[PDB]
């Protein structure tokens, strides 16, 4: 990108940051800025400087330097902030990361009403590298700065104004005018000439600041023991407070140049891009098609999963209509919806107007206007086939015939119709309105235009869509089905279940295999596993543990579990008990890698990076580990292969490497590499 500078008749130089989409601070922009300043501070006709962004946006961050802190220190701190001419930032839209830092370097800040200000760097496993670790705590206080930097959450201009981050809030149309007026106020001493970096007004006493910093470090190691960058960022903050500002800067410059080398930040960076690339499906989204406008959606369900969908839809101003069989089931579903909205109330007129979008019905005549249908009925083929027969009958010819099915082949559902091009899989994960993932299941017949449509609806409802193929368990569930079975096989072999959970919950998972198995509900976990037992028998293990518990009907260990596993004694008891935490993880996750490769090779998933996001966003796989596939290559295919074969030749074909993994593992090549 670039920057344009123009000197008004009042002597104020206005510099516009120009680098779409969000005017990120590329080196290009920065060096143009440097030149701008060197000129402005040499021109006699220039009195002060104002900085603003193009197209109603200040700067969204860094683009996607000689020393370590050449910019932070030499350009931003010395050249700009320590200049003998005042700078004023004119903020509109957003000021995030480097964008917010550049603004903090200025001597005053004018902002438009609802602009966003924050330092999101930590979410990428990186740190503020332009002086944010210094100026933020000095402008808003240590307590707030710590919250913003650690939580990575942005703040609106209004709140920013009351914190001392923003000096004034004016309408977007007065932004630059106010700023240049402010700039000449400073030159004329009608207003203070403050340097943020050497401001102590807002800091706590040296001793208490250490108490606040110590505390933070402590609880950051309690929640996120896995990542180091936050603590590394807290270091830069403490140094700046104790040893002074200039020491703090160089400390940040050092921390920033080494934090990029961490293996977990490469993982976090990979997850960032992979999140974006899930909507790129070759042969579908490269055709020049454009999403259709869906103005009305029908949800045939009313049950738990159905009521969830409806919630997500109306929450995004989608007129939704539920159809049920009996009046009871209908009034029941509508009830769950309201309950879901009332929950997040504890606006009012908000969650009262969105209830008008939801309209009930026990008929099909109200489908003559629907642009998309989602069926969320019990997993009964006979019944689903019938629903799609009626759908094809009462619906418009363009209407999308989507199903939330989880265990039934999409091709069999549309058996009684001739609308195979309109039938697609819209797979949600309960709770439908919280789980961020959406599996768009395409068939051989699903038309590209329908996928492009759904792909767009997913984005509209704050979901992250992946386009997967039609097969047993699609991508997410099929991927992690070995997970639970590998665990239970280890248990039947003597392995302590609670050790398993602890080893894996510390690995990065939000839960343990068994711990999560209880949360999902034995009835559900066993119902979704059946699918794979019947389609991949020679690769699955039906542990009688759960069933035996079902027939007998703030959580802690159960002294009555030992007798339960013993009863399911079909296998013997090796030395799989007393395994290392590394081994537990390796025997529980490598089979998942193995399955991910089958999915990737079979073409079920478009690209490895999609599998990463899927496992991450569907099964809470550790983001800092990049994803199930990124992690697999992080260890090495040759290792995973060699280790997975040793088990195959010692426990059964369950651990046997699939052709794709084997062929690649031997050559020591990357697994995430495109299929050829």
From Swiss-Prot:
Gene disruption phenotype: Accumulation of long-chain acyl-CoA substrates and increased size of peroxisomes.
Keywords: Fatty acid metabolism, Glyoxysome, Isomerase, Lipid metabolism, Lyase, Multifunctional enzyme, NAD, Oxidoreductase, Peroxisome
Stored InterPro entries: 3-OHacyl-CoA_DH_CS, 3-OHacyl-CoA_DH_NAD-bd, 3HC_DH_C, 6-PGluconate_DH-like_C_sf, ClpP/crotonase-like_dom_sf, Enoyl-CoA_hyd/isom_CS, Enoyl-CoA_hydra/iso, NAD(P)-bd_dom_sf
This protein's GO CC annotations: cytosol; glyoxysome; nucleolus; peroxisome; plant-type cell wall; plasmodesma
Tissue-specific expression: Highly expressed in senescing leaves and at lower levels in flowers and siliques.
This enzyme's EC code(s): 4.2.1.17, 5.1.2.3, 5.3.3.8, 1.1.1.35
Active-site residue list: 101 (nucleophile), 121 (proton acceptor)
Gene Ontology terms, MF aspect: 3-hydroxyacyl-CoA dehydratase activity; 3-hydroxyacyl-CoA dehydrogenase activity; 3-hydroxybutyryl-CoA epimerase activity; delta(3)-delta(2)-enoyl-CoA isomerase activity; NAD+ binding
Catalytic activity entry: a (3S)-3-hydroxyacyl-CoA = a (2E)-enoyl-CoA + H2O; a 4-saturated-(3S)-3-hydroxyacyl-CoA = a (3E)-enoyl-CoA + H2O; (3S)-3-hydroxybutanoyl-CoA = (2E)-butenoyl-CoA + H2O; (3S)-hydroxyoctanoyl-CoA = (2E)-octenoyl-CoA + H2O
Domain of life: Eukaryota
Pathway(s) this gene product operates in, as recorded in its UniProt entry: Lipid metabolism; fatty acid beta-oxidation
Cell location: Glyoxysome; Peroxisome
Function: Involved in peroxisomal fatty acid beta-oxidation during seed germination. Possesses enoyl-CoA hydratase activity against long chain substrates (C14-C18) and 3-hydroxyacyl-CoA dehydrogenase activity against chains of variable sizes (C6-C18). Possesses 3-hydroxy-3-phenylpropionyl-CoA dehydrogenase activity and is involved in the peroxisomal beta-oxidation pathway for the biosynthesis of benzoic acid (BA). Required for the accumulation in seeds of substituted hydroxybenzoylated choline esters, which are BA-containing secondary metabolites.
Domain notes: The epimerase and isomerase activities are contained in the N-terminal region while the dehydrogenase activity is in the C-terminal region.
Family membership noted in the UniProt record: In the N-terminal section; belongs to the enoyl-CoA hydratase/isomerase family. In the central section; belongs to the 3-hydroxyacyl-CoA dehydrogenase family.
Matches recorded under PANTHER family: 3-HYDROXYACYL-COA DEHYROGENASE (PTHR23309), PEROXISOMAL FATTY ACID BETA-OXIDATION MULTIFUNCTIONAL PROTEIN MFP2 (PTHR23309:SF9)
Name of this protein: Peroxisomal fatty acid beta-oxidation multifunctional protein MFP2
Gene name, Swiss-Prot/TrEMBL: MFP2
């Amino acid at each position: 990108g670039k920057t344009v500078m123009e000197v008004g008749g009042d002597g104020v130089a206005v510099i516009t940051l120009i680098n779409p989409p969000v005017n990120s601070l590329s080196f290009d922009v920065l060096y143009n800025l440097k030149s701008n300043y060197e000129e402005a501070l040499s021109r006699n006709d220039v009195k002060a400087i104002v900085i603003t962004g193009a197209k109603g946006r200040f700067s969204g961050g860094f683009d996607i330097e000689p020393k370590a802190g050449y910019i932070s220190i030499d350009i931003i701190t010395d050249l700009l902030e320590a200049a003998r001419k005042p700078s004023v930032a004119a903020i509109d839209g957003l000021a995030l990361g480097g964008g917010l830092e550049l603004a903090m370097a200025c001597h005053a800040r004018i902002s438009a009403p609802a602009a966003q200000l924050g330092l999101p760097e930590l979410q990428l496993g990186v740190i503020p590298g332009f002086g944010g670790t210094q100026r933020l705590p000095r402008l808003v206080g240590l307590t707030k700065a710590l919250e913003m930097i650690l939580t990575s959450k942005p703040v609106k201009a209004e709140e920013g104004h009351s914190l001392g981050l923003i000096d004034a809030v004016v309408p977007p149309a007065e932004l630059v005018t106010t700023a240049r007026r402010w700039a000449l106020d400073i030159v004329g001493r009608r207003k203070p000439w403050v340097s943020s970096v050497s401001k102590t007004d807002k800091l706590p006493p040296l001793g208490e600041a250490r108490e606040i910093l110590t505390f933070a470090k402590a609880q950051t190691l309690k929640r996120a023991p896995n990542m180091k960058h936050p603590l590394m960022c807290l270091d830069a903050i403490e140094v700046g407070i104790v040893s002074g500002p200039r020491a703090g800067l160089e400390k940040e410059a050092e921390v920033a140049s080494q934090v990029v080398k961490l293996d977990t930040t490469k993982g976090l960076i990979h997850v960032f891009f992979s999140q974006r690339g899930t909507a790129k499906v070759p042969g579908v989204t490269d055709r020049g098609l454009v999403p259709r406008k869906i103005k009305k959606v029908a949800i045939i369900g009313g049950g738990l999963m159905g009521s969830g969908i409806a919630t997500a839809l109306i929450l995004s101003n989608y007129p939704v209509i539920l159809k049920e069989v009996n009046e009871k089931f209908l009034e029941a579903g509508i009830g769950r919806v309201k309950a879901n909205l009332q929950s997040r109330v504890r606006s009012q007129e908000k969650f009262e107007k969105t209830m008008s979008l939801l309209k009930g019905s026990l008929d099909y005549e109200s489908f003559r206007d629907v642009d998309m249908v989602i069926e969320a009925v019990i997993e009964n083929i006979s019944l689903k086939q019938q629903i799609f027969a009626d759908l094809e009958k009462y619906c418009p010819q363009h209407c999308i015939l989507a199903s939330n099915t989880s265990t039934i082949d999409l091709n069999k559902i549309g058996e009684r119709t001739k609308s195979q091009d309109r039938i697609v899989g819209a797979h949600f994960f309960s709770p439908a309105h919280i789980m961020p993932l959406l599996e768009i299941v395409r068939t051989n017949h699903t038309s590209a235009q329908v996928i492009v449509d759904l792909l767009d609806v997913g984005k509209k409802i704050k979901k992250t869509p992946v386009v997967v193929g039609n097969c047993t368990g699609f991508a997410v569930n099929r991927m992690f089905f070995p997970y639970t079975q590998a665990a239970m096989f280890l248990v039947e072999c003597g392995a302590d279940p609670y050790l398993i959970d602890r080893a894996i919950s510390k690995f990065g998972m939000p839960m343990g295999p068994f711990r999560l198995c209880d949360l999902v509900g034995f009835g559900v976990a066993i119902a979704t596993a059946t699918q794979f037992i019947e389609n991949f028998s020679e690769r699955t293990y039906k542990s009688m543990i759960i069933p035996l518990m079902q027939e007998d009907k703030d959580p802690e260990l159960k002294k009555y579990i030992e007798k339960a596993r013993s009863i399911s004694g079909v296998k013997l008891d090796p030395k799989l008990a007393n395994l290392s935490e590394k081994d537990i993880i390796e025997m529980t996750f490598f089979p998942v890698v193995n399955e991910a490769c089958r999915v990737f090779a079979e073409g079920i998933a478009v690209k490895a990076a999609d599998l990463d996001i899927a496992g991450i966003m569907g099964m809470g796989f550790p983001p800092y580990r990049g994803g199930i596939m990124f992690w697999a290559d992080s260890i090495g295919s040759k290792y995973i292969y060699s280790r997975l074969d040793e088990w195959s030749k010692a426990y059964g074909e369950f651990f046997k490497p699939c052709a794709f993994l084997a062929e690649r593992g031997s050559k020591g090549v990357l697994l995430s590499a495109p299929v050829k």
